[PDB]
Amino acid sequence: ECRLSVKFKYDYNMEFADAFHAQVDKVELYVFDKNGKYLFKQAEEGSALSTGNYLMEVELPVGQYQFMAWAGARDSYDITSLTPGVSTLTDLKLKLKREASLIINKRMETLWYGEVINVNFDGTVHQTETINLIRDTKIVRFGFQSYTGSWTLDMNDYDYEIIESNGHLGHDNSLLDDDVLSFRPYYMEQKDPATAYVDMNTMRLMEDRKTRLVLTEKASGKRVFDINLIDYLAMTNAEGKNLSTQEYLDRQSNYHIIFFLSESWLAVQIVVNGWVHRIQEENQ
């Protein structure tokens, strides 16, 4: 007669505060048993989640379970379909959809990973479990300007890519083996050459990856800029906070980076969300 409820939170962000009700409009809870065998999933989405008091009511027999979730997953992603009593956690995988070209140029609906929890429900009390959500999709606005302003960098001369094989996530949120994808702008603006920017997005930024930002000249097809974005972000100060690289990468999901370049396409300095950082030539 007692009921088991699930609370979802999204406080693992740079505001260190829960933004679930404000940002997450779909949760899908996966339930596995004592043995790690899949039992079912349960999806809810829409206005219910926005109240500030959303709880998911989960009908479950007395017993021990593991829960995890994916939140926000809609048309951009294929999540494997599991068979009750047959499949286990390691069967659950999420893959960003791509065509043969391996180019992604759409803005994906924001994706959150719900960490795995052990749940022991004996039916004697009303109980609420909490799912903790980690943002996996990362939005970046890039600007490119002359450091001395002695030449005008024109942003429509080039193509822009973020290159990584981060499009296949396991049940533990780890990057599975996958093809390397080319993430390219979903929006570009050069109204004021000083205003000018491209908006891009990618999947998880990992401290142990070497995710690349690559610019290619339309005219020649020559690559003019090729940097390790993870490394450029690691060199920074996590926006003044006391964070490990991975924690900053997980917590922050909007990155507005201006590159101030030499005439020879060397980054002299970058500005990441307002923070100025000199790039040491040896680490360019």
Numbering used by the authors: 34 to 317
Paper passage:
The BT1062 gene of B. thetaiotaomicron encodes a predicted lipoprotein with a molecular weight of 36 535 Da (residues 1–317) and a calculated isoelectric point of 4.8. BT1062 is a member of a functionally uncharacterized protein family [Pfam PF08842 or DUF1812 (domain of unknown function family 1812)] consisting of ∼80 Bacteroidetes proteins of around 300–400 residues. Therefore, the BT1062–BT1068 genes are most likely to encode a fimbriae (or pili) system similar to that of the minor fimbriae of P. gingivalis, with BT1062 being equivalent to mfa2. Thus, DUF1812 is a collection of diverse proteins that are likely to be fimbrial components.
The selenomethionine derivative of BT1062 (residues 23–317) with an N-terminal His tag was expressed in E. coli and purified by metal-affinity chromatography. The crystal structure of BT1062 was determined in the tetragonal space group P41212 at 2.2 Å resolution using the MAD method. The structure of BT1062 consists of a tandem repeat of two domains: I (34–170) and II (171–317). BT1062 is composed of 21 β-strands (β1–β21), three α-helices (α1–α3) and five 310-helices. BT1062 is likely to exist as a monomer in solution, which is consistent with crystal-packing analysis and analytical size-exclusion chromatography. The most significant additional structural feature of BT1062 is a small β-sheet at the domain boundary formed by the EF loop of domain I and the BC loop of domain II. Domain II contains a three-helix insertion between strands F and G as well as a β-hairpin attachment (β20–β21) at the C-terminus. Most sequence homologs of BT1062 and Mfa2 contain two highly conserved cysteines at the N-terminus (Cys25 and Cys35) located near the tip of the bilobal molecule. The conformation of the peptide between the two conserved cysteines is likely to be flexible since residues 24–33 are exposed to solvent and disordered in the crystal with no interpretable electron density. The most conserved surface residues of BT1062 homologs correspond to a short sequence motif 306N(G/D)W308 located in the β20–β21 loop.
